[PDB]
Amino acid sequence: GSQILCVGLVVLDVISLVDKYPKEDSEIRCLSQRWQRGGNASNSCTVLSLLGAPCAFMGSMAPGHVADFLVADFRRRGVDVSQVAWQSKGDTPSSCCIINNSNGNRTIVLHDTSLPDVSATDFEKVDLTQFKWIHIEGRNASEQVKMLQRIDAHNTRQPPEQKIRVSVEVEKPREELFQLFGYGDVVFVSKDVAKHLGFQSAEEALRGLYGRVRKGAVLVCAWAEEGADALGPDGKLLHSDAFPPPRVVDTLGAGDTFNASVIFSLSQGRSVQEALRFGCQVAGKKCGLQGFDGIV
Amino acid sequence: SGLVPRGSQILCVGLVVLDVISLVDKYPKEDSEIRCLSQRWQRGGNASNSCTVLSLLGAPCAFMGSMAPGHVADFLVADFRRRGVDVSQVAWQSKGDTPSSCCIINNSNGNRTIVLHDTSLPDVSATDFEKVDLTQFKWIHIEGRNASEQVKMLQRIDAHNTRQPPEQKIRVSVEVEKPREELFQLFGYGDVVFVSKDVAKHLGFQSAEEALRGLYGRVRKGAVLVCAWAEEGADALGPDGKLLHSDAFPPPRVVDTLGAGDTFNASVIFSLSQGRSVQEALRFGCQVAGKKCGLQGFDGIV
Numbered sequence A: 001g002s003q004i005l006c007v008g009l010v011v012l013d014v015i016s017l018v019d020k021y022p023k024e025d026s027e028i029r030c031l032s033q034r035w036q037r038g039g040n041a042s043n044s045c046t047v048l049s050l051l052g053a054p055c056a057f058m059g060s061m062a063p064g065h066v067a068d069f070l071v072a073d074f075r076r077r078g079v080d081v082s083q084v085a086w087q088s089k090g091d092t093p094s095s096c097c098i099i100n101n102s103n104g105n106r107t108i109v110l111h112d113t114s115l116p117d118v119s120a121t122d123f124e125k126v127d128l129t130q131f132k133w134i135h136i137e138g139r140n141a142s143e144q145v146k147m148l149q150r151i152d153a154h155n156t157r158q159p160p161e162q163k164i165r166v167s168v169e170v171e172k173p174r175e176e177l178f179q180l181f182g183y184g185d186v187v188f189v190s191k192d193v194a195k196h197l198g199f200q201s202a203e204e205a206l207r208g209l210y211g212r213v214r215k216g217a218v219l220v221c222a223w224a225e226e227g228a229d230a231l232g233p234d235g236k237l238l239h240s241d242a243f244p245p246p247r248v249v250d251t252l253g254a255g256d257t258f259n260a261s262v263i264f265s266l267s268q269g270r271s272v273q274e275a276l277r278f279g280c281q282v283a284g285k286k287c288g289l290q291g292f293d294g295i296v
Numbered sequence B: 001s002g003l004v005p006r007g008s009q010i011l012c013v014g015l016v017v018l019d020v021i022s023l024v025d026k027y028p029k030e031d032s033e034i035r036c037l038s039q040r041w042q043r044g045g046n047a048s049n050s051c052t053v054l055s056l057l058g059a060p061c062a063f064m065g066s067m068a069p070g071h072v073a074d075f076l077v078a079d080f081r082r083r084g085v086d087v088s089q090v091a092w093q094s095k096g097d098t099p100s101s102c103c104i105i106n107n108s109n110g111n112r113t114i115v116l117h118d119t120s121l122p123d124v125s126a127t128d129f130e131k132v133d134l135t136q137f138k139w140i141h142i143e144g145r146n147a148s149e150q151v152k153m154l155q156r157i158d159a160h161n162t163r164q165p166p167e168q169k170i171r172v173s174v175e176v177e178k179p180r181e182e183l184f185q186l187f188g189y190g191d192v193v194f195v196s197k198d199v200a201k202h203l204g205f206q207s208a209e210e211a212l213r214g215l216y217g218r219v220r221k222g223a224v225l226v227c228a229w230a231e232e233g234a235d236a237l238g239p240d241g242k243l244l245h246s247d248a249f250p251p252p253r254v255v256d257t258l259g260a261g262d263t264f265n266a267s268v269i270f271s272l273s274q275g276r277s278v279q280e281a282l283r284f285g286c287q288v289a290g291k292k293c294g295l296q297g298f299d300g301i302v
């Protein structure tokens, strides 16, 4: 029970840093370029390792030079990759990421290689005794629900002191992912999902969506410059103001930095109020830096 | 790198870039996440593209350009090798990024949005060019970029040629593709000068004929000035003052014109290096470039 596992995607992010976002049909020169190991679950793993937590990543990877870069990067961070589901395909997903240096805005053109996701059968082969926390990035909901049901069955057999804590993220407004609300101790809901469901604030979203979570769960919603809110079984709304940097330069993976920081703080025995603030603190510091170097 | 026989290769000096092309349903709004329909990694750059065409035409060829060690350079090297291009003359850098460009293509319009590569990578210097043994090249083509440094490279080829008998003299070509003032000094260099339609239009010329008559005064004695003008074909003008022309060879269906100008340049160079006349080289240039326009990439231009 020493590691934090993040189940989700690993994506190669091909980053172009620009002065201003290009208008359609225009030619602009970027300030700089870099390759970054991306994907929500993989970004959270980077932040967790930088925070000093032993962590493991589970995702599908195809053998090749792109995977070689990602594995070397994962290992340079100390991310445990022994759970990677290697695929027979041969195509790793990549993204063209446009980062506006004037305000930190990040535009992603994702190339989904349609490679097979992590299955419940792949998850069934994993020894769970080594993990204290399991975080799942919403993707293939039907398969993920089974992975979540396996963790539940494991936890029924364990005393309260050795129970694996669970978190889920619902970041895309896809109807099939809304079944994931009923799973996990901690549920992260994005501003984009909340807005798509008609909610105009983190407070509106939490009060309107709490009925979907399982008994005793905490629902969390970050709302960019408005900070973040959380709602638990006591019905008390919790809030943290954001910690914006004086100059916002890169917000790519800020949501993932918030998620990992909230997870880390909660796994350390801190209260929901303290975890919300810490989430905003680390994510806010990240927004004033290119990439993840310098958060610690 | 193996024994290269004397005066056998065609060298192209210029840019190599990794083009990341993303085909999208709708142009993304700022700070949004969208899925592309299809995405492709392609080796680009004028000199780099001409090398591909030269290899496919059956000419031994080499590329000279700047690269920085890394995964981008690894992909670009593997692509050059896939096209049978000799990369032994690449100037490896200790500072900068290997050029990478991001093109967004809208499926619902056909519009192209380009986020061009940064300029952190140093160009090939006259000092880097001075270390190259020239005896293995029969032809040297220079893509105009850092003109003041390239003028010195051109002066080194001239000095080499003064001691050579007419059969062992290295033939020279230059391309002026961007309407940048500093590049215009390159007109006075080379046996063959390629001028783009874009440059000609920016200088106020409305046709290949107008451009050739108006710019011939800038080339060195005995040089041939060449200007391709898309569907209007291509023209050439030499010291005899006779305007030469070839009609275009458009394909039944146009698929892709990216690198068509580079296909024309390499084909003209190849034909001339084979002892053919300027008239025949113009026609061959239009023939191969026209065939390319009906194909995706360079496979099948044969």
Ligand SMILES: CS(=O)(=O)c1cccc2[nH]c3c(c12)CCCc1ccc(CN2CC[C@](O)(c4ccccc4)C2)cc1-3
Binding pocket: A103, A104, A105, A222, A223, A224, A225, A226, A227, A228, A242, A243, A244, A245, A248, A251, A254, A255, A258, A279, A280, A283, A284, A287
């Ligand atoms: C976990 S978290 O830390 O809550 C967080 C998570 C994910 C994404 C996030 N974005 C932002 C934060 C944030 C919070 C702190 C940093 C910040 C500062 C300013 C703005 C708002 N800016 C961003 C360009 C902006 O939209 C703009 C538009 C037009 C002109 C100038 C700026 C107006 C957002 C964030």
Ligand SMILES: CS(=O)(=O)c1cccc2[nH]c3c(c12)CCCc1ccc(CN2CC[C@](O)(c4ccccc4)C2)cc1-3
Binding pocket: B228, B229, B230, B231, B233, B234, B248, B249, B250, B251, B254, B255, B256, B257, B260, B261, B264, B285, B286, B287, B289, B290, B293
């Ligand atoms: C050496 S050369 O062979 O003279 C040559 C050199 C450089 C560039 C060149 N372009 C074209 C030629 C050409 C020659 C004939 C073929 C052709 C047909 C149609 C159009 C017109 N354009 C306008 C959008 C276009 O119709 C398109 C459609 C679909 C995909 C991409 C472009 C295509 C140009 C050329």
